[PDB]
Amino acid sequence: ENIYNRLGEDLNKWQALLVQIRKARGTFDNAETKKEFGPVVIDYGKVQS
């Protein structure tokens, strides 16, 4: 409801944030299960689903 009130009657209804949500699906929705960086590996395995 907060989002609806903030963006009530946007370009049409939102038309903007619904666009960046698909981009925010990044760092996510990939066959990659754990992000490696040097010797530090962060495994987003329990939350992936």
Binding site: R22, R25, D29, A31
Partner: peptide
Amino acid sequence: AWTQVLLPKIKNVVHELRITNQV
């Protein structure tokens, strides 16, 4: 011989099924 192998060293070809944006 290659044909009957299909049905000679043959490489194993593999492909996967995944899902993205629920497709």
